[PDB]
UniProtKB/Swiss-Prot annotation:
This is Ubiquitin-fold modifier-conjugating enzyme 1. The gene is UFC1. InterPro entries: UBQ-conjugating_enzyme/RWD, Ufc1. One of its GO terms (biological process) is brain development. It is linked to Neurodevelopmental disorder with spasticity and poor growth: An autosomal recessive disorder apparent soon after birth or in early infancy. NEDSG is characterized by axial hypotonia, delayed psychomotor development, poor feeding, failure to thrive, peripheral spasticity with hyperreflexia, poor overall growth, and microcephaly in most patients. Additional variable features include contractures, facial dysmorphisms, and ocular movement abnormalities. Changing T107I: In NEDSG; decreased ability to form thioester bond with UFM1; decreased protein ufmylation. E2-like enzyme which specifically catalyzes the second step in ufmylation. Accepts the ubiquitin-like modifier UFM1 from the E1 enzyme UBA5 and forms an intermediate with UFM1 via a thioester linkage. Ufmylation is involved in various processes, such as ribosome recycling, response to DNA damage, interferon response or reticulophagy (also called ER-phagy). Keywords: Disease variant, Isopeptide bond, Ubl conjugation, Ubl conjugation pathway. It comes from Homo sapiens (Human). The active site is at E117.
């Protein structure tokens, strides 16, 4: 299918994750976090090599709260946005909800508190890949393409300024 090839083209060089564990799962959660960090840092290193180093992420000590920055280039100007999310208890079967709080109420494709609204195809795509996708895949397949529609639109409409 076109969808299968599009997914593989975007994620094929991102390390796949393995462990079915969420924040409550003790030593299995510690192992899941090793897969999350190994997958994120390989994605970041690929991004630098492709001149598309577009985000930084850190977590709290337990790896249950994530926060950082993404950058979006439009007409060669670089825009920075703070991003944050909580790991749901039912992770990795349930996908985290990325929030961009400074854009809260500035686009229709977003819920209260700045939680971005992905298309209906993102959720079944995550579901069919559990537990192989993690935070690197949420950034690559979720926030990435969301920015590539919403940021150009909001610059166009005079809603955000450099």
């Amino acid at each position: 299918s076109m969808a299968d090839e599009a997914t593989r083209r975007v994620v094929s060089e991102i390390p796949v994750l393995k462990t079915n564990a969420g924040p409550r799962d003790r030593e299995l959660w510690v192992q899941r976090l090793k897969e999350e960090y190994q997958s994120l840092i390989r994605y970041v290193e690929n991004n630098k090599n492709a001149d598309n180093d577009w985000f930084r992420l850190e977590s709290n000590k337990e790896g249950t709260r994530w926060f950082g920055k993404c950058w979006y280039i439009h007409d060669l100007l670089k825009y920075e946005f703070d991003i944050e999310f909580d790991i749901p208890i039912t992770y990795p079967t349930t996908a985290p909800e990325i929030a961009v709080p400074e854009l809260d109420g500035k686009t229709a494709k977003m819920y209260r508190g700045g939680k971005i609204e992905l298309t209906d195809h993102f959720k079944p795509l995550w579901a069919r890949n559990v537990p192989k996708f993690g935070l690197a895949h949420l950034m690559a397949l979720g926030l990435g393409p969301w920015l590539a529609v919403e940021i150009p639109d909001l610059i166009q409409k005079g809603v955000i300024h450099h």
